[model samples]
Target: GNPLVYLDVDANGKPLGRVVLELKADVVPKTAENFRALCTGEKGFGYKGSTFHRVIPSFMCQAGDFTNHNGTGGKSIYGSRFPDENFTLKHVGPGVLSMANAGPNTNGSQFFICTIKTDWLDGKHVVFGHVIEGMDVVKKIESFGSKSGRTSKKIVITDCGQLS
Candidate 1:
């Protein structure tokens, strides 16, 4: 019952669009269902105008700030932290999507897509999905310099929908 959400990142490793997360029937059904409920309509549309806010080259790209329109602007949604699903998926290389959290069981709307093999994050974050294609697109995302904190290009999620 998990919806496979397709996160489309822009040239700067920011989420510019999304696709339904196709749940793996054998995976965490409840968690997948919960994700679907949160991202399906009105409430889920909350991400429509959001920006990718943060991007670290070859590492990760993060978005899902619900409070502010700007990068530094939002807060996590209202809810008790969900227990770590602890799935076996790995965040080993490009196109890997993983939940973003402050600590164990603290994941909210924030999430990231990995652009490299990050073994350090293997057991830490919940691995949900991977990019089925366009990883070269991920690699081409414009990089913001370490000190600048400013991206030369912006990542925009133009729209979102389910895969047929």
Candidate 2:
């Protein structure tokens, strides 16, 4: 069995939007582990205050860059990066949380949350967590990134930690 973790996100663009997500470590263990470790601050750092630097409306909101605030700065617990896992985990629908990579087998700290079904990402990324609440918060953040890949204001993850 795996434990659940909570991700509390707040978007300053919309002034008061928030989202709460529970990472499903039970379903996707390895993929979830890196994400969990990064979130829990188990490695002297975490996802708290990490900005959603990249976003695509009608698609996903990407974040977890606790290192550089840029897309390329996150590192894995193993040091550089780790091989991708859960390729079989499908991006079946909205509210799906998937790993983001430079290419294949480069999964690190970056991840995305889809607001729509994106079957094309099924094999390309590992879908580990899903939003159990706050689709509206996701939508609000999406709106700011609607016109560009970059957000006018980044959505801040206020806190992230192990739930159980």
Report the number of the highest-lDDT candidate: 2
Model 1 lDDT per residue over 18-69, tens place = 3334544356554454444444433534455465667777587676665664
Task: Write down the lDDT of every candidate, Cα atoms only.
Answer: 0.58, 0.79
lDDT at 111, model 1: 65
For each candidate, what TM-score against the reference?
0.72, 0.89
Deviating ranges (above 4 Å) for candidate 2: 13-18
Clashing pairs in 2: none
Q: Estimate, for each residue in 39-150, the C-alpha lDDT of model 2 and write its tens digit.
A: 7898887788788899989999899888899898888787768887667668888898888888888887888999899998878888887877778878877887855678
- List candidate 1 stretches off by more than 4 Å: 7-25, 34-39, 42-45, 69-80, 142-150
- What's the distance in Å from true for residue 96, model 1? 1.0
The global Cα lDDT (0 to 1) of model 2 is: 0.79
